[PDB]
RNA sequence: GUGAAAUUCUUGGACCGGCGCAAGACGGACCAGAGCGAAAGCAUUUGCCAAGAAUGUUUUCAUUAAUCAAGAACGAAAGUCGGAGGUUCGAAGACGAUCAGAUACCGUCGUAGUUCCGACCAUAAACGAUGCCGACCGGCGAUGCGGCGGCGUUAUUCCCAUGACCCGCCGGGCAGCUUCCGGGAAACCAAAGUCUUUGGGUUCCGGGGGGAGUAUGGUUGCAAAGCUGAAACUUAAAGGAAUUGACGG
């Protein structure tokens, strides 16, 4: 049975999509199929922000960010729990989970 | 078996058969 | 709508429809009289002209071809032909 | 666009104007003073090219150096032989501006 | 930090580096603890920057097209 | 749908229902005939003659104003082209593709386009020989066609 | 610089040492990693240009420029993608207005005018009529050749 | 009629020397004995005289070329590269 | 380097940091259920060369058209031949681990290959597991290109053009959401609808599961192999979609 209408990928009007390597296991995954997470993390932990501020020679020093784009095969994506299996009707929606700001 | 490996086994047997027949 | 009058559509949707898909084919283009400044004569120019139209009495260009409509040079007046 | 323009104009010189094909006839027409344009393939020998240029300068007529060769000039003329030099007696098609 | 202090160095610029290349770009677990230990040991901290080697594009990453099966 | 493309475009010309000559058109039939004669002397194909006539001189349809089509007028006067316009242009395109191809052997896309163009050429030539516009023994050869176009 | 931006760095290679002082000269500039990675965002087109240009005094420089299409404040569409002709015209424009800030002047007044990235700012001003750009900078310059290292030039660059 | 199915010019070698060697020498011999269009006079009379020497019978022009072909791809790329380096060298 | 190790490199300065040099690959992020191409496939800049869809058209010809046995062009990757090149990765192979065994999964090394040109091969889950041309049959919001019409903002400029947004309409596309149109065994599909109320044109092709895409014959190929392709015999099921339960390192 056809599990997904888009066959688990975003390739619609293409013949071939270039492959990428999974950041976890270095598997060749098509670019439109791999799970992408753009992590924007503070370069220091939240426990150490105060200590770096104390030890800084500057007063108004903004801590730099760390920009990394991650690609996962669905095997590593499921095993690392970034994505989870969902019900038949719950597979259909594409809304990303909310940021949960408060 | 996996169908691909049955195909490979069949190809090996076919080359052996061709070699036997050509030997005559 | 099950009872849309296909015989007598109002002119608004008659205009918005494609030239071929109207009830009767009607071209979107027309003809115009172009007045060149500094000149007296009148040249009839196709609205969707594909060629650079020139005055025969003055070495001046009237319209420049574009994708859909010829673009008139500035300072030139134009009117319609029988609507 | 220049090459296709000169090829089309050369085609229209044929079938509508008086031309002449070849070296000896070109020189004959030039020294009679009725050759209004001389076209030279770049395959032409340098001595022949220079001599025809001098003849044209004496006759005060234009020389165009065709961006082809004798094979391609022959094809542009619509013939199935190589022509290396040609003259136009009268274009009839505004290749030669009045 | 104590070696730098006994050689008369008081402040440090920081250049965090991951493995880089075609391999991972995430810094290891030791970056946070190393930087925090530098900060709390009296050493002053200046500019901090990521200097991970990022290829404009790299050679083929090791493991094969099926990756690391585990 | 297109003959050799998977295109299904609709871009056409919508000829108006009024076949009558506009009242503001002062040019008579003989005037338009003489204009077509001059533009044919200049070397313009009937498509270009129609384009120039419509763009500048305001004539909507040469057939509507003269009663004859442009190619009919040229053929009656006796200066129609030896080859039909569209077949001439297709042979020209094939010659251009061949000239590009003999310098670029790896352009297999150009080879495919050349095959498509020559198939169109052969179909159109078969049609013209059916209508006896072309001689019954007329044939398009790749080698000798370059002397016919441009 | 006393109060300038902090995402810009300089190379400043050392040529001559006299006494206990190492005297430097310009070698190249570059943006920081965090700023560059923050500038690159989805649903927008970035234009990258480079040009090898020789200064009046013989320094050869490879200037790299980046620019990102800016969405309007009232724009509803998710993406701001420039067409290929627009990107090509922007690239050509910002190559020919990096050439002229280098060809007609010395290295010193090139360096002091790329300190506030005036070249990138006027590039941003010049491309508004094609497609708006917001993050325009000289991303990188690298020293390709140096002219024979005259000591007098180095000392006047340091001193007066 | 067609006299040979596939050997063509190397049918003179009979059954000797091996099929692959005959196939390898076939295109070399075809290019060796072919007549190329002269780039000076336009006639197709430029034929090999000795190894590396190509002579046109019409204009009596002798050109130094490849061993079996009139010009080698190596030499063509070299000529293009030398042209580019010349136009780069001057300004 | 790993789960842990070990093979391996290391006072001969290994790893690390700096400055350069060289080589061959690869073109991140921008990169999207976006574009183009007959498919395969195509992502650094610039230039050249031809080509093409869509749009605009009151331009031309006037049925020239659709599908197509035979035949022909192209055809991922792997594979073959010849010439260059060989950085990384890495079939084979060697070794270290793990294990009851481990010819594997993990690690180190590493040949062919992977890169370019030239010539073969013609196969992929070559997939949308879904022939092409044409007509009709719902709605909605987007998006790519072309065109047309509009309050306004914006760029220079003195104003219009022209760009960038905003609002619409049309035409062709990549798609999406929704719907008791309708169909279907259902999953689902606006096509897989307009089908017992059965006929728009046309091509290929299936007839229970195996034997078997096998044997043999023919034909193509350097080879590997490709195309065409049975029978004896055997078997009462094999399968598809959904439901409940059981189980899941
Ligand atoms: Mg399943
Ligand atoms: Mg595919
Ligand atoms: Mg697993
Ligand atoms: Mg291949
Ligand atoms: Mg080889
Ligand atoms: Mg290795
Ligand atoms: Mg049919
Ligand atoms: Mg059966
Ligand atoms: Zn993975
Ligand atoms: Zn010769």
Curated annotation (Swiss-Prot), chain A:
Modified residues (Phosphoserine): 53
Keyword set includes S-adenosyl-L-methionine: no
GO cellular component: cytoplasm; cytoplasmic side of rough endoplasmic reticulum membrane; cytosol; cytosolic small ribosomal subunit; extracellular exosome; membrane; nucleoplasm; ribosome
InterPro entries, sorted: Ribosomal_eS26, Ribosomal_eS26_CS, Ribosomal_eS26_sf
Gene Ontology molecular function, alphabetical: cadherin binding; mRNA binding; RNA binding; structural constituent of ribosome
A Pfam family the protein falls into: Ribosomal_S26e
Sequence segments annotated as region (Disordered): 84-102
Keywords: Cytoplasm, Diamond-Blackfan anemia, Disease variant, Endoplasmic reticulum, Phosphoprotein, Ribonucleoprotein, Ribosomal protein
Compartments it resides in: Cytoplasm, Cytosol; Cytoplasm; Rough endoplasmic reticulum
Main location: cytoplasm
A GO biological-process term: translation
Basic and acidic residues composition-biased segments: 86-96
Subunit structure: Component of the 40S small ribosomal subunit.
Family to which this protein belongs: Belongs to the eukaryotic ribosomal protein eS26 family.
Function per UniProt: Component of the small ribosomal subunit. The ribosome is a large ribonucleoprotein complex responsible for the synthesis of proteins in the cell.
Protein name: Small ribosomal subunit protein eS26
Organism this protein belongs to: Homo sapiens (Human)
Swiss-Prot record, chain C:
Cofactor note as given: Binds 1 zinc ion per subunit.
This protein's record includes keyword Ribonucleoprotein: yes
Domain of life (superkingdom): Eukaryota
Main location: cytoplasm
Composition bias type Basic and acidic residues, residue spans: 1-15
Cofactor names: Zn(2+)
Single Gene Ontology BP annotation: ribosomal small subunit assembly
Cellular component GO terms held in the UniProt record: cytosol; cytosolic ribosome; cytosolic small ribosomal subunit; GABA-ergic synapse; glutamatergic synapse; nucleolus; nucleoplasm; nucleus
Disordered, as annotated region: 1-22
Binding site for Zn(2+): 36, 39, 55, 58
Signal peptide: none
Stated role: Component of the small ribosomal subunit. The ribosome is a large ribonucleoprotein complex responsible for the synthesis of proteins in the cell. Required for proper rRNA processing and maturation of 18S rRNAs. Part of the small subunit (SSU) processome, first precursor of the small eukaryotic ribosomal subunit.
Assembly notes: Component of the small ribosomal subunit. Part of the small subunit (SSU) processome, composed of more than 70 proteins and the RNA chaperone small nucleolar RNA (snoRNA) U3.
Protein name as it appears in the record: Small ribosomal subunit protein eS27
Source species: Homo sapiens
Lineage: Eukaryota, Metazoa, Chordata, Craniata, Vertebrata
Curated annotation (Swiss-Prot), chain D:
Main location: cytoplasm
GO BP annotations listed: antimicrobial humoral immune response mediated by antimicrobial peptide; cytoplasmic translation; defense response to Gram-negative bacterium; killing of cells of another organism; translation
N6-acetyllysine sites (modified residues): 18
GO molecular function list: RNA binding; structural constituent of ribosome
GO cellular component, one term: cytosol
Keywords carried by this UniProt record: Acetylation, Cytoplasm, Isopeptide bond, Phosphoprotein, Ribonucleoprotein, Ribosomal protein, Ubl conjugation
Localisation: Cytoplasm
SUPFAM superfamilies to which the protein is assigned, alphabetical: L30e-like
One Pfam family, short name: Ribosomal_L7Ae
Cross-link Glycyl lysine isopeptide (Lys-Gly) (interchain with G-Cter in SUMO2) placement: 18
Modified positions (Phosphoserine) in chain numbering: 2, 8
Quaternary context: Component of the large ribosomal subunit.
Similarity annotation: Belongs to the eukaryotic ribosomal protein eL30 family.
Role this protein plays: Component of the large ribosomal subunit. The ribosome is a large ribonucleoprotein complex responsible for the synthesis of proteins in the cell.
HAMAP family (UniProt xref): Ribosomal_eL30
Listed name of the protein: Large ribosomal subunit protein eL30
Organism: Homo sapiens
UniProtKB/Swiss-Prot annotation, chain E:
Location of region: Disordered: 50-70
Protein location: Cytoplasm; Nucleus, Nucleolus
Positions where Phosphoserine occurs in the chain: 58
Biased composition (Basic residues): 61-70
Signal peptide start-end: none
Residues bearing the modification Phosphothreonine: 52
UniProt crosslink position (Glycyl lysine isopeptide (Lys-Gly) (interchain with G-Cter in SUMO2)): 25
Protein origin, superkingdom: Eukaryota
Family under the similarity heading: Belongs to the universal ribosomal protein uS11 family.
Assembly mode: Component of the small ribosomal subunit. Part of the small subunit (SSU) processome, composed of more than 70 proteins and the RNA chaperone small nucleolar RNA (snoRNA) U3.
Protein's UniProt name: Small ribosomal subunit protein uS11
Entire protein: shown range: 82 to 151 of 151
């Amino acid at each position: 049975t056809k599990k997904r209408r888009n066959n688990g990928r975003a390739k619609k009007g293409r013949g071939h999509v270039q492959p990428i390597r999974c950041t976890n296991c270095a598997r060749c995954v098509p670019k439109d199929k791999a799970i992408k997470k753009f992590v924007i993390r503070n370069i220091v932990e939240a426990a150490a922000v105060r200590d770096i501020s104390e030890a800084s020679v500057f007063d108004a020093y903004v801590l730099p960010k760390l920009y990394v784009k991650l690609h996962y095969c669905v095997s590593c994506a499921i095993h690392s729990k970034v994505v989870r299996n969902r019900s038949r009707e719950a597979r259909k929606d594409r809304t990303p989970p909310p940021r949960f700001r408060p | 078996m996996r169908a691909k490996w049955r195909k490979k086994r069949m190809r090996r047997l076919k080359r052996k058969r061709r070699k036997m027949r050509q030997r005559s | 709508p099950l009872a849309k009058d296909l015989l007598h559509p109002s002119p608004e949707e008659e205009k918005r429809k494609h030239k071929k898909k109207r009830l009767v084919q009607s071209p979107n283009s027309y003809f115009m009289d172009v007045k060149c400044p500094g000149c007296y004569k009148i040249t009839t120019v196709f609205s969707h002209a594909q060629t650079v139209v020139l005055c025969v009495g003055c070495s001046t260009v009237l319209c420049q071809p574009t994708g859909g409509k010829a673009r008139l040079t500035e300072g030139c007046s134009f009117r319609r032909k029988q609507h | 666009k220049s090459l296709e323009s000169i090829n089309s104009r050369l085609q229209l010189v044929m079938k509508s104007g008086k031309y002449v094909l070849g070296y000896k006839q070109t020189l004959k027409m030039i020294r009679q003073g009725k050759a209004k344009l001389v076209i030279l393939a770049n395959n032409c020998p340098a001595l022949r090219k220079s001599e025809i240029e001098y003849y044209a300068m004496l006759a005060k007529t234009g020389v165009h150096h065709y961006s082809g060769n004798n094979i391609e000039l022959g094809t542009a003329c619509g013939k199935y032989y190589r022509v290396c030099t040609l003259a136009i007696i009268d274009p009839g098609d505004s290749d030669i501006i009045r | 930090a104590q070696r730098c202090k006994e050689l008369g160095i008081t402040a440090l610029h920081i250049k965090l580096r991951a493995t880089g290349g075609n391999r991972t770009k995430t810094p290891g677990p030791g970056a946070q603890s190393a930087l925090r230990a530098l900060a709390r040991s009296g050493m002053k901290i200046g500019r901090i920057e990521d200097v991970t080697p990022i290829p404009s594009d790299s050679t083929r990453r090791k493991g094969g097209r099926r990756g690391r099966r585990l | 749908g297109r003959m050799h493309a998977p295109g299904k475009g609709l871009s056409q010309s919508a000829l108006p229902y009024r076949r009558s000559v506009p009242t503001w058109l002062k040019l008579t039939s003989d005037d338009v005939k003489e204009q077509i004669y001059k533009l044919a002397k200049k070397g313009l194909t009937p498509s270009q003659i129609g384009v120039i006539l419509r763009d500048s001189h305001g004539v909507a349809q040469v057939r509507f104003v003269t009663g004859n089509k442009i190619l009919r007028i040229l053929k009656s006067k006796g200066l129609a082209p030896d080859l039909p316009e569209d077949l001439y242009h297709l042979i020209k395109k094939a010659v251009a593709v061949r000239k590009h191809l003999e310098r670029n052997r790896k352009d297999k896309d150009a080879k495919f386009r050349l095959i498509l163009i020559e198939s169109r050429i052969h179909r159109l030539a078969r049609y013209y020989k059916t209508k006896r516009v072309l001689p019954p023994n007329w044939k398009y050869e790749s080698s000798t066609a370059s002397a016919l176009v441009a | 610089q006393n109060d300038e931006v902090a995402f810009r760095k300089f190379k400043l290679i050392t040529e001559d040492v006299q006494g206990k002082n190492c005297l430097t000269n310009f070698h190249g500039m570059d943006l920081t990693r965090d700023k560059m990675c923050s500038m690159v965002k989805k649903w927008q087109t970035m234009i990258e240009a480079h040009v090898d240009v020789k200064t009046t005094d013989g320094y050869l420089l490879r200037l790299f420029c980046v620019g990102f299409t800016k969405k309007r404040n009232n724009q509803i569409r998710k993406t701001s993608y420039a067409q290929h002709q627009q990107v090509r015209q922007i690239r050509k424009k910002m190559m020919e207005i990096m050439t002229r800030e280098v060809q007609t002047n010395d290295l010193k007044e090139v360096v002091n005018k790329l300190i506030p990235d005036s070249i990138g700012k006027d590039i941003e001003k010049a491309c508004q009529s094609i497609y708006p750009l917001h993050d325009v900078f000289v991303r990188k310059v690298k020293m390709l050749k140096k002219p024979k290292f005259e000591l007098g030039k180095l000392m006047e660059l340091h001193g007066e | 009629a067609k006299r040979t199915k596939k050997v063509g010019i190397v049918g003179k070698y009979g059954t000797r020397y091996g099929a692959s060697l005959r196939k390898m020498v076939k295109k070399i011999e075809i290019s060796q004995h072919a007549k190329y269009t002269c780039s000076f006079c336009g006639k197709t009379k430029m034929k090999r005289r000795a190894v590396g020497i190509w002579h046109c019978g019409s204009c009596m022009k002798t050109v130094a070329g490849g061993a079996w072909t009139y010009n080698t791809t190596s030499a063509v790329t070299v000529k293009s590269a030398i042209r580019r380096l010349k136009e780069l060298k001057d300004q």
